[PDB]
Design a protein around this ligand. Structure first.
Ligand SMILES: [Zn+2]
Length: 46
């Protein structure tokens, strides 16, 4: 039962769907992907 991920600070680019924080917009966009799943070309989803 491991735990503890202290390091990521409050970022200006935080998602609303789930509520994730991202320092760079790119990180936020690529993330939103998890929320938008369509035409999945290849076994990749978790
Ligand atoms: Zn999200």
């Amino acid at each position: 039962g491991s735990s503890g991920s202290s390091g990521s600070g409050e970022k200006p680019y935080v998602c609303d769907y789930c509520g994730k924080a991202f320092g760079l917009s790119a990180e936020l966009v690529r993330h939103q992907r998890i929320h938008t799943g369509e035409k999945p070309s290849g076994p990749s989803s978790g």
